[PDB]
Amino acid sequence: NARNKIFISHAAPDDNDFTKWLALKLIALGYEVWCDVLFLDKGADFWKVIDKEIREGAIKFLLATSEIAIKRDGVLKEIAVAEKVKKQLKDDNFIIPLIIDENLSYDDLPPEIIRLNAVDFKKSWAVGLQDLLKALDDQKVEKNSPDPDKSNALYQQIFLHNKGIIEREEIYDSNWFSILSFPKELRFHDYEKLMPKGFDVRELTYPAVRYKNYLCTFAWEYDFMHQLPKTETYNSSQTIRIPTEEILSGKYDSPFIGNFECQRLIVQLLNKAFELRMKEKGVREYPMSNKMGYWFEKGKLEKDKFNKVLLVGKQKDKHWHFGISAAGKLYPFPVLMISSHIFFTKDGKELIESKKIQHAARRRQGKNWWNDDWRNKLLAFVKYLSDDENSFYLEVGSEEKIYISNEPVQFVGKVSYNMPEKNNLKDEAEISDLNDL
């Protein structure tokens, strides 16, 4: 009821930013302030409070003056009430227009406030502040000790009411796909003495890696006999066997080979197995520098869709295909880690040679796609990679296979955010494009 809360009337959204700034600035000085922005629960009685306030608690009536806000009937309604009180208060300088519009013409001001003294913030907010502050002090307005603590409290509580985090569990999908089982034994073979010099281990049907004087694989002793006939004379006793579970647990260290060395070798075998399986799976290949990507041709899938998810489409005069690449990782958990790329083709079959065009189109198409697009496209591809309901397999041996689940490893968090009311993602993409330019 005391006139200590300086009343600031303005257009709810048009003068919102200016008011919110001026309100908190004034508060920091210790000036008590009343405006609609400092308020959260405003319904259909707030005007009654606005009244009880303009008439009972207002040592001043500073009003943002703008063409848009001077056209608003509510603004004129507040003006009329403030005049009525100004006459009762005999303050005259009670109502203090704060002209904030460059193109505002003074004649458009209402005849009620056409002759009053107005602090100008059109030239600048800071310069208008000093003049506003000077007028307030000359009006001997009462102010408490400066408190930016109160302004900070008002800011976070009101300005960030529904812009924070919520303690709500969120389950996330990943690109890590769990590996359900491994072949029981990892076998090293002394094929060298029976292997032609200069032979390539990558050419081997099944995954096999050269290490020291040994060939490492999960395969049986007699599977490369087709490629290496001399292995028909190989002796099984020369083969060195390690239980793979002890390899995953890291409980096997031997003078023959270290745990880390054998784990890297298992990773290499896994990658080669995935490349071979993908070669078998009918997808096309994009030879990346470090890994190999796999993408669908146009018309290979049903309507270029799997699981009702578009994996092949058109961008301008280019055909984008969602491709994946895979790597292995034994720690922290045995997982195949699929990566997602977009590969472009002139017609859907011939990849565009220029890496620069590939990169530009990839960046643009990735800008277009949001969280769902990426997640659903990656899931669809692996769901298509499936050989049964729950997994697919990589052929490491004639009797030995590696089973990878087609559902990615999921991560649970204890915090989440609330979805925005307005989706401005396209504008954000355009703005980020300008940031690049």
């Binding site: 600035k25 900070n152 985090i165 996330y172 958990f333 955010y417 954000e428 300008l434």
Partner: protein
Amino acid sequence: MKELIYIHEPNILFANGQKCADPRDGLALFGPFTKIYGIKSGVVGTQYGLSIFKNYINHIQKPIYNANNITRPMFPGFEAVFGCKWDADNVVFKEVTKEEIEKILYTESNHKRTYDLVSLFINKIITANKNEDEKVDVWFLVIPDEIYQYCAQFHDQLKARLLEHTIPTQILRESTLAWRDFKNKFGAPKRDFSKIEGHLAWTISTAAFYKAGGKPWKLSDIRSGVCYLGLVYKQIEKSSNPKNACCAAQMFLDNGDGTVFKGEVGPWYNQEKHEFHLNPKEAKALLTQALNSYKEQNGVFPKEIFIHAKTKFNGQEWNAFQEVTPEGTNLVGVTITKTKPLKLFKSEGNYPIMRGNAFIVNERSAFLWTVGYVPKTESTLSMEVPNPIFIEINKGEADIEQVLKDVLALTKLNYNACIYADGVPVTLRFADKIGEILTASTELKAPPLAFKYYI
């Protein structure tokens, strides 16, 4: 299930002890942590460029709104935000005549074009600095966007040849200040800053306020006596020994201003590992420089020192660094990578995972989402799925949660660009830039300078 943890966003401190998480909001509401009396300007460009600068400076004195004022807050005004007048009246002007620029561009080799251009701007700034008593706080190089387009970059060589003389410098393009005046063949601006017009000013303003001796913000609740050092390596391309590589130390306290310590150009780059590794001698030299600078600034040796690196650490350089570390000083080696491919997708919504989420792999390694979705700005720092950075405690004993909190904390520090936050911590954010600055001129022996002379 594979549980995650949330690292709460760290607040930054502003004027009057006010802690807020958004630099734009904090600067607009309370003002910078330390305020300067004013920003004396020096412009280094053509008359057209000078008019562009003056008009922009006069125009950012008046409120500039953003099309989206939730993702990017509007700029209240230079005087309204900072509290000092960046007037265009008190501005020294070095007028590069068009003839000088075109005559230099005539050169066939850009190496020379940039050098000759950088040389001209250096001379114009120095003569003005030394010969007169004009205490110009910041020298603004309003170079035509063309100069940047043609000129190995202008930024790095200019920053190095000013590093010689230790004077602050900010570079701007005519397009950046006056984008409306530059249009394509269709009557539209080459770059439409219409919806970010309020963002751009923010950036520029904060940059200027940093280079004129002001501290926009500083971290709020950092523990006492903690020093963050980020090694910066970059191989000299022209060196006969392909192992010759520059080194550098990036001392960051809670304040976030930063100090750069140059090191000796030596055979650090290992080609077969692709990892840079320095001998015990230079390790001891660099960490002695950092410790001595910290002691002379703060009066005591750090109680903890974290040497953030983009690669791994050997035993010898760590035992070297360890030899020059006082007992009380806990030397921690943290490797931060942005390569490991782990992507978390959200089950519902076109919006990605929140920033601050983290996967703790083990007691000494963890994934941290420094890129993500910010509820406050209702936007994302990257239009692509967030790629988490892998933080590993390579050497020394620490706590991984504290390391992740510190990494997020360091990321907030970014005066160069006003944004809720950045993806890389400041210790490694400008690692490549500072490296390029250093290899631009390695002969000059810089004393330990600050980022005000690097970024």
